[PDB]
Design a protein around this nucleic acid. Structure first.
Lengths: 52, 53, 280
DNA sequence: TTGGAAAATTTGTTTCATAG
DNA sequence: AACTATGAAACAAATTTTCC
């Protein structure tokens, strides 16, 4: 049933937009975290080098 | 009615553009965080080169 | 590797840039062969200041392109092109969710290497996006960059690492036919007044071809859009003579960074190009 | 191997139905 | 009662993947 096969395609296409927005949120969280840790590491090493 | 319809067109256009701009915004954010991430990382590898003297 | 690396103290250099398009093949097909160069030749890479006599190993993987921080593409992979009647370069095939080609860098050959063992495989979108962690879509993400690496061993026990990326390669059949593409710009800048004519050199420049200048904040929030009157009458199906538009705020004190793109229809626009206006 | 393009899949758009 | 926002249906346009 073609009308039924397209129905699922659209059902999946919509569900896909959801998962994507979600994956990007979980991604934004982690990046802000890693950047924080990385900002520290950059500062630790920054001090050390200055005192060598 | 031709009018009640061109209006539902808008309401659906609006509803669609809104949800699209959202992903376009979450996507813009991650892409700038990934930029800051590589800049930190490159920075770290530079400081580490200096630490080795 | 997603970690950054740069043209080392030895300077790894792309000598012969590959061709702008290279329709990749699927696993449902037979190899469409190795990437080539616009000369009919093949791309060529070389480590410049390596005064030694030990053979290195050049790594190859397929990386992204477009306006992003370089990284291994998730939809494309290097294909160890089994070679022709005379396979010039040898190969080693490794993974880590992304194939990596290892080919020798002979001191005999002037630490140079011809890439002809490198082809491009395309993975099915629905398979990639399926996996957790991926936020990228395959839909229209069809450009690529050949990425090469070296790990130079030193006297000090050290390892100086280098990396280089080829110009972007369009790996889609249709998009190769549909999307315009800039390969060259006359100028990368000018002062607020504009007016000067910029010469664009690219692929698929029809007449539907319009060029637009855009301004963006650090949030991606666009604040400027201006259609540049690009001259059209007689030229070449891949060369545009654009008249740089005057900048909105002609009173800046610091140079501003804008973008521009060549566009056909609506869903046929080239990746954003870089431009910058300078204050007077 | 190449090049082309039918076949298959996705995503966009206009309507309807309909909760709020 | 009337009207916007939104998910889902149908069918068309866009883009990818299989086939020749």
């Amino acid at each position: 049933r073609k009308r039924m096969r397209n129905r699922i395609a659209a059902s999946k296409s919509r569900k896909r937009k959801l998962e994507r927005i979600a994956r990007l949120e979980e991604k934004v969280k982690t990046l802000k975290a890693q950047n924080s840790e990385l900002a520290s590491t950059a500062n630790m090493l920054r001090e050390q080098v200055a005192q060598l | 009615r031709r009018i009640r319809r061109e209006r539902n067109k808008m309401a659906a256009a609006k509803s669609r553009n809104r949800r699209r701009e959202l992903t376009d915004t979450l996507q813009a954010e991650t892409d700038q965080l990934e930029d800051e991430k590589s800049a930190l990382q490159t920075e770290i590898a530079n400081l580490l080169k200096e630490k080795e003297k | 590797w997603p970690l950054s690396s740069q043209s080392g103290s030895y300077e790894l250099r792309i000598e012969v840039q590959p061709k702008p398009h290279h329709r990749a093949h699927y696993e449902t097909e037979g190899s469409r062969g190795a990437v080539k160069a616009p000369t009919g030749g093949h791309p060529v890479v070389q480590l410049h200041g390596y005064m030694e006599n030990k053979p290195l190993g050049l790594q190859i993987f397929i990386g992204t392109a477009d306006e992003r921080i370089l990284k291994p593409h998730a939809f494309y992979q290097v294909h160890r092109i089994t070679g022709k009647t005379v396979t010039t370069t040898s190969y080693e095939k490794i993974v880590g969710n992304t194939k990596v080609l290892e080919i020798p860098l002979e001191p005999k050959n002037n630490m140079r290497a011809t890439i002809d063992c490198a082809g491009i495989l395309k993975l099915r979108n629905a398979d990639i996006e399926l996996r957790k962690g991926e936020t990228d879509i395959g839909r229209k993400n069809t450009r690529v960059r050949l990425v090469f690496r070296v790990h130079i061993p030193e006297s000090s026990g050290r390892i100086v690492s280098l990396q280089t990326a080829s110009n972007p390669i369009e790996c889609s059949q249709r998009s190769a036919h549909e999307l315009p593409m800039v390969e060259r710009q006359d100028t990368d800048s000018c002062l607020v007044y504009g007016g000067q004519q910029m010469i664009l050199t690219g692929q698929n420049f029809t007449s539907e071809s319009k060029v637009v200048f855009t301004e963006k904040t650090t949030d991606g929030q666009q604040i400027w859009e201006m259609e540049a009157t690009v001259d059209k009458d007689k030229s070449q199906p891949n060369m545009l003579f654009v008249e740089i538009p005057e900048y909105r705020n002609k009173h800046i004190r610091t140079p501003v960074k804008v973008n521009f793109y060549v566009i056909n229809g609506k869903r046929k626009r080239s990746q954003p190009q870089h431009f910058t206006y300078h204050p007077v």
